[PDB]
Amino acid sequence: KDDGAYKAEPAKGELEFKNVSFAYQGKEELALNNISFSVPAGKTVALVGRSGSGKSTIANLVTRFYDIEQGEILLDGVNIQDYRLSNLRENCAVVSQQVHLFNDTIANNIAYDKYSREEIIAAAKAAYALEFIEKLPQGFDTVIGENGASLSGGQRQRLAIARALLRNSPVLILDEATTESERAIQSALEELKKDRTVVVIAHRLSTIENADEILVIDHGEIRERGNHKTLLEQNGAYKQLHSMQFTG
């Protein structure tokens, strides 16, 4: 599995899927069928589509959660399978509700290459988490409880963003859920998304409407491609999903 010996320190962040097909183990039918798209370094691409579309499979493949046998996924023009897995994962950070927190200090949860307290604070500030952390009796040295359940969900999402900002990965995979601090998160995500390549499993209207490109995934294929304005003009699948607020 971890056969690759090549590394990018850091990668510029250019992504490309070229003729990618994928089927789950034990299934003949394809989950993804001849997927091709390119994301220039520093751009944001929102994957939208109904549940079951395969949009999440596309995102999962970027970090080799599973490998393909047909087509290629390239990072800076090199097949992702050719990179040392640890380096691929260092270059491509994931943010999802599945962010693992654990009993330890807030600082250590953010730091989970060593970073200084200064660097950790800067990451929390950019993530709109500094204000709630510093008001706490012990600040960054506060020990979280119940492996993260002591914090609110909005607080947990911002720690996940801080953790991502600290690593400063050139590629970000953001999985949006279909919040009391929602405004703060949107600003935090706008900071996280700046100067890096972002692939979003998207549900927020603000994320989608501001993406450089939107790919509408439908039964394992790309049905429509454009941005919010060009896709609305088409009066097709994007426009309909948008009307229903990406709740499909």
Place this chain on the structure above:
Amino acid sequence: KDDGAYKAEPAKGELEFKNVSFAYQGKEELALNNISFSVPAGKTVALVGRSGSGKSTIANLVTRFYDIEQGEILLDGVNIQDYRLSNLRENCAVVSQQVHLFNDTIANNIAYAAQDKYSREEIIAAAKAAYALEFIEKLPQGFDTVIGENGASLSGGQRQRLAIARALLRNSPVLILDEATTESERAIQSALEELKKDRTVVVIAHRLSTIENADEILVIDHGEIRERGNHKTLLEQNGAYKQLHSMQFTG
């Protein structure tokens, strides 16, 4: 990190903490202070206590989420650090507040579990024992149903039972169960009673049914074990357990 060359295939499941102390990196204060307890193979031990107690740190240490430098944690009398990490993790399964699910079939999500491959028949047996068979078989594609949104297509009760099925399939001799402080709550309680049979169980506990049926309860308070017993012996003491129990383990 993964310096150990020893393996148990499988371990019997005897656990022991002997004089264990632990502090988070960069902290002077101890998170756990001179923790000592034994769990004979096949017994269930419930760790109870208020948020911040360190009960979850105890559970996290069993699978080497972090390592100690004072005292020892032993599996079948061998320090956990001496086992190949992959084998320690094969012997000690975790049912976490949040189990990692992903776009793929229900069967592949259940099988994600162990090192060796399992048959469809073995996967079905695991789902049955976990009270997940009925909801999976009523579905249009049954076990071949592809979950969506990396698990969000399923209900939370359904996701917990898949985590239990996943644990039953690997049949690990040690189970670490983290209870959250449900529409299919009854089904889960029976599923957990199946999962807890014939294996060593360490529970970060909140359910009254789990706690009242544990072989031993350890009340953790500010990084120390304050009380030890079972539901009946601890109630007799009219102390910390009784008070926590009176508030339904919501602390």
